[PDB]
Design a protein around this ligand. Structure first.
Ligand SMILES: CC(C)(C(=O)NCCSc1ccccc1C(F)(F)F)S(=O)(=O)c1ccc(C(F)(F)F)cn1
Ligand SMILES: CC(C)(C(=O)NCCSc1ccccc1C(F)(F)F)S(=O)(=O)c1ccc(C(F)(F)F)cn1
Ligand SMILES: CC(C)(C(=O)NCCSc1ccccc1C(F)(F)F)S(=O)(=O)c1ccc(C(F)(F)F)cn1
Ligand SMILES: CC(C)(C(=O)NCCSc1ccccc1C(F)(F)F)S(=O)(=O)c1ccc(C(F)(F)F)cn1
Ligand SMILES: CC(C)(C(=O)NCCSc1ccccc1C(F)(F)F)S(=O)(=O)c1ccc(C(F)(F)F)cn1
Ligand SMILES: CC(C)(C(=O)NCCSc1ccccc1C(F)(F)F)S(=O)(=O)c1ccc(C(F)(F)F)cn1
Ligand SMILES: CC(C)(C(=O)NCCSc1ccccc1C(F)(F)F)S(=O)(=O)c1ccc(C(F)(F)F)cn1
Ligand SMILES: CC(C)(C(=O)NCCSc1ccccc1C(F)(F)F)S(=O)(=O)c1ccc(C(F)(F)F)cn1
Ligand SMILES: CC(C)(C(=O)NCCSc1ccccc1C(F)(F)F)S(=O)(=O)c1ccc(C(F)(F)F)cn1
Lengths: 178, 177, 178, 181, 183, 177, 178, 183, 180
């Protein structure tokens, strides 16, 4: 990691840029949370720019970012570069309405969740199903779409170009340059 | 002409160790062989097994009920899980255990995919659980509610306890029993 | 394997019983083919009783049994014990019409197929899709059902009791005893 | 971890302590150390204990729990992502009225879960059952519920939404943002 | 195995049955099968059950135990090399007065040993303690001893010489050769 | 204050080895850092890479085109697969290779599921293949048909050949070139 | 600037996890340092350990007794095996446990060679067993016969049971508990 | 295994029994079974027990030893290649006067040795005591086989003690070195 | 991985304390050698305190420490804490006579060398091992002020000694209980 007179990523936090790169785990998600809280403390009255290149990962770890995005005072602008798939698309669509962006050749993908005793099986299947539904409802709200749309369109892997994600309502604009 | 083929002449069939498709079908084949040789004489099905696959156990179960001979069952060592299910399925009046054998019964237990596929497989597993409880209640002359409660977790029984439960008919200490 | 004065399975071939047990592989399927051909040679004018307890397996290995069932002169009666899933259900439904049976607590399951360079990917996906369709059409013929029924009902794993498989048209009768 | 001091050390200066991931002897004592550090720096200010954890070792979690209660600062807890098993126990141990969950977090509670001679197995089985009852009694106290409630409700994995966790008594309030307070 | 209808098959004609090595479901049921065969061949003649075993599965050993007691032939037992654990149990289970050991064999007895949720741990610990108690009671019967003796004497591994096992009541005689037999 | 941070002062950014999400984002971060420091001066993007993830390469690609500075590219050692794609994406007129570097281009290459899922993923992969061919044709000033044919299998090019193909602009032997 | 170094300024030393040569010597080094900085101030030795090597534990034990400062001990989480030994070894009157910590004591446990060598090491282990029982009896103000009986198999104790036993002096719920 | 039935069964007809390789429960019991078969076939003719073994389990070797002493036939022993450890013990247990070695074979004797292994100090004390009982027992039995003082065997088995055929003859472990039948 | 107060072991090096912890290897032994030379350089007129908790390790690595202890001008006092076994006990016994110490519950263990091709090569390496065995028994007899035959007898198998037994044998000079 390059240094400059701190590391490259801490240098970019001075631009209020936070990256999510690769799979969403508790550890990688909480690193994003900590940067969000740090930037809000630095200045609660300036936007944050959350750049997302992720294939997805843990639902609960993603929810920790999601709820932090909505809790803190700064607007969280989101930007898809490379790809935002699964929980990465979810967080992308969670950016402040009107501040959700994708680079022109990035892609988006949305899908339903994917992963003892009979009694335990029943328990885990039921929570998975609730997650499924919760994700569909929150995504429909993000996209200003009907729940039944999301239920249909996440049944199997649904890849979208930046244009298709814009029409779907997952992002607001495709940015080619400043 | 091994020892087991020799006892096959006595119409004794063993199930030893885990219930798999392969070990179950070996039992099924012997049951059909014995029915072919003599459809009008009892078969003695000796079970010493920790359990194993439900569907493989069901292949033995339905063959037991399909063939003309009464399939007497005998627990030696243990009959646990699908082994107890098969023991309890012997012809009523002809289900036996040796005095220090033990029986264990419990609900289905499993060792991925989309939530849609998990849902389907959870529901099939619950149907299996209900079916086994219903069949076992029939075997033991008990209410379904008893079986549902009594198989929530591993339930070990002595030979006497399994008799009192309704899983077998008599404890045999020797022939004079 | 018990012997009797040959092994237990060769003894049951005298009853014209052939077993399929466990996964369908080239080797296990071809063993079934060889027994079918042997029994036809022994007497072309008597039924064969094909007992199936299988979770499925290779499509092409199953087709070797399927086409042999239809080629040889004896009617091939089929019987589900334990389970016939995937290619096992396919072969079960392929038995001579009116001679397809299931034991009372067996189960049936049907589903669509499941498994380099971009060019190669295209090639394998296309053959998989053809298999999908071929399986659906042959199953619809076996079941006296519309193709679109099979397409809907094999999209995900579709478990059926013996009664449900009978109503679906996969078997003819449920046998409890002789 | 971005560094100049890293991001977690910087937020520690705001009196935020994180529990992230499995509760081990090492992750738990790191939490204990931070709690003691913040008390020594100012024994009179609240500490904000943010938990995203699937659970882990009971005795390791107990070291955090007793430290939370030993130190003079109120320890406020926040559930973000999830607080499961010992994570949920620690969440419910925050200062009453200061236990929080974010709106889409989840909580899960359950009984304990893990050779020798039969004498040794008996001893360890007994010890595990004492732990089971101790944790159900402590949790009931946190939730202002009965021991019998917790025994029924932890027999298998019991997942709760933030609202369900609030109604149960595990947390005091769901915070969408600061205006929720 | 020399094929003289092999060597063990040949000795089965002398009504000798071996247990060699660990007691598993597979080795235990082979012993059971042979016991049933020899009873079928002649129900009024003794069987000689030669044991050289470190132990193994309790439930598998119980299948042999209950078979020994079920069939009509007396099952005489002989310790050669060792009979440890469930091996010792089966040795002590032979027909009283026909339990033997060679002079430098050894016997060992001990309580059960094992190599989920708390609810399931409780259920399985309780069952292991039931097994421990049952084995101690059955052993006290075989040895004509107080239950309390066996509880004390199986707490840890209890190695005994042939003479110690005879004085314990676990076997009846030590045989150096055929001329050794008494009574 | 390592050697690479020192060359970062010269506005040199390296991509060395496989293109992954992590190595690509490290490149992206440096491009954004350099634009922040000076949006009005060229960046020199030195590529020695066998390729790697398409989507990770796309994150670099779109950042190159998004930021204000011209991103000059230089192939040293090799630029293969997504490495050649990035090399070809440098600001036109400012794409370079050293004389003994080599370039390789090819169609997408992948290392399960239901036929429905295989179909979806095969089709996405074909869209990627078409997209890369279309973008590369734009970079090289060639017809799409040329790229489609020329990437069917691994296509190795010398520095001269890549220049003649349209992938780079000049071969630099030294500065006087 | 790390947190354990910071806490060392409060004269707090931690033993966390298994007692090894390396982790025990790190404790030794901190005890020597704190004595060097101020030989007339108490040291607070916080223990959360499942036990470990007896000889490594003895290096801590003898260091605790060698240095001039009183070494107060605190059980947090658990103090088992050599962890309990060191807990009980703190300056009498200054041995504490948190309310939900646990203590466990047991005889020595080893997880090859000629009979002569096995004889030698078996005898050394029995000397160790007797040394630990005798020293622990002294720490608890109890009989040698008590400890011999009470460590034959794993013996778990609540904080109240440990106090009753004499292994610690007081249970601290908070500072007002002293 | 050539089949002319197989070669070893054919040599069994000549009352030759092999122990080859390590002494395990399974390899020991096969020897016991052959010894009992040959006694059954003729209880008065010598058995020739050929030993090429590096040793193995004590209790397994004790099953053979006690069987050799139990049966009516004299068991002559012949060392070929090597008899080490429990192999050497069994070599020395052959009928006195009929213990032989081929001229370039070797013998090795040593005290008991445990491969590796575990547990509480009480348990380790129990098993170390049993191992020392076994060490003493083997030393006394070998002293008797060799017609030597116990103290000799204790000294001479402290570490691995390799002996040529002539050294083993001098020691009292064997009676004669056979280069051919004329010996 | 080590408290910083740089670090705690560097801080105790200011007190002229050097640790040997765990197995003696070329790397851990050269680190001890480096610290001894450093402390000699800083002040050749003060003792070094060499604290040993070690199960042993390489003979040649141990010899690099031993000859360095004897080469430098400072007295190297040794202290057994926890245990000093094998080469650890050798080095403990090698401290400046009168300045070799053990804490009351430490233990010492001494034994003969122990290791975990062509016959010619086997003969060569076996002869070298026996030279090492003989050299260590002679050097240890010298440190213990004992006859060589005593050491030959007492190292034939693992010989565990309490602190008192080690003092009586001659391996250490005094047992230290507290700082006063
Ligand atoms: C995040 C994913 C990986 C997920 O399920 N993570 C954790 C599940 S944890 C688990 C495991 C076993 C047993 C019980 C559980 C528990 F119940 F606890 F969860 S998801 O891939 O399936 C997913 C969700 C949403 C989207 C969308 F945004 F596109 F809409 C895309 N992907
Ligand atoms: C037999 C057991 C091992 C079992 O579940 N086998 C089949 C697993 S395959 C499977 C895997 C994933 C998804 C779906 C499936 C499937 F659809 F196939 F099931 S059981 O342990 O659960 C058991 C149940 C009942 C009893 C009683 F009889 F005592 F009452 C005893 N044992
Ligand atoms: C049989 C199954 C396992 C299958 O696909 N076997 C072999 C595929 S080979 C392959 C692999 C890689 C690349 C290309 C190929 C190829 F193209 F060559 F095939 S199936 O499970 O999917 C299935 C089919 C039908 C049914 C029904 F009957 F229920 F209807 C159930 N299951
Ligand atoms: C913490 C868990 C992992 C646990 O048991 N840890 C350590 C056990 S250590 C052990 C291992 C073997 C032998 C003996 C022992 C010993 F006895 F020493 F413990 S728990 O999952 O089971 C759990 C507890 C409570 C909750 C609640 F909060 F929701 F209520 C959730 N989970
Ligand atoms: C036989 C042994 C190996 C044994 O425990 N077998 C199976 C245990 S069952 C078990 C384990 C875990 C969970 C559930 C279960 C279950 F439910 F299955 F029980 S024993 O060696 O321990 C033994 C017994 C008796 C004697 C005596 F004679 F000497 F007295 C000596 N040894
Ligand atoms: C980059 C490579 C490694 C690639 O395919 N990465 C992404 C794989 S992930 C994946 C896996 C399964 C299902 C779907 C997907 C997904 F949807 F994600 F793609 S490439 O080798 O194929 C390549 C392509 C083009 C060129 C050119 F630039 F020269 F023209 C060079 N290299
Ligand atoms: C510390 C333990 C792990 C122990 O034995 N460590 C090292 C042994 S080293 C060894 C290994 C092999 C051969 C020889 C040896 C040697 F002889 F060298 F030791 S102990 O668990 O057994 C234990 C002791 C005391 C307590 C109490 F405090 F509760 F009382 C609890 N536990
Ligand atoms: C046979 C050998 C391998 C042996 O010890 N087997 C017994 C292992 S059982 C065991 C395992 C763990 C714990 C305790 C025990 C038990 F206590 F039960 F033993 S021996 O090599 O040591 C040997 C002995 C004698 C001779 C001589 F004849 F020359 F003199 C040569 N070799
Ligand atoms: C140091 C030990 C580990 C040792 O042998 N190290 C050197 C291995 S090098 C080697 C490897 C292969 C072939 C040849 C060789 C070579 F010949 F080179 F060595 S020692 O433990 O055995 C030991 C010695 C003495 C004492 C005493 F102090 F107590 F007296 C204690 N211990």
């Amino acid at each position: 990691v390059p240094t400059v007179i701190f590391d490259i990523y801490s240098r970019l936090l001075k631009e209020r840029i936070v990256f999510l790169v690769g799979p969403v785990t508790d550890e990688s998600a909480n690193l994003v949370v900590a940067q969000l809280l740090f930037l809000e403390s630095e200045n609660p009255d300036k936007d944050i720019f959350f750049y997302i290149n992720s294939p997805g990962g843990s639902v609960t770890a993603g929810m920790s970012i999601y709820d932090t995005m909505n809790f803190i005072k700064p607007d969280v602008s989101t930007l898809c570069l490379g790809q935002a798939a699964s929980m990465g698309a979810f967080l992308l669509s969670a950016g402040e309405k009107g501040k959700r962006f994708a680079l022109p050749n990035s892609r988006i993908m949305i899908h339903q969740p994917l992963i003892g005793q009979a009694s335990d099986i029943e328990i885990h299947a039921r929570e998975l199903l609730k997650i499924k539904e919760k994700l569909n409802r929150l995504m429909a709200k993000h996209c200003d779409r009907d729940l039944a749309d999301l239920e249909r369109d996440t049944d199997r892997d649904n890849f979208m170009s930046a244009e298709e994600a814009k029409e779907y309502g997952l992002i607001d604009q495709i940015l080619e340059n400043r």
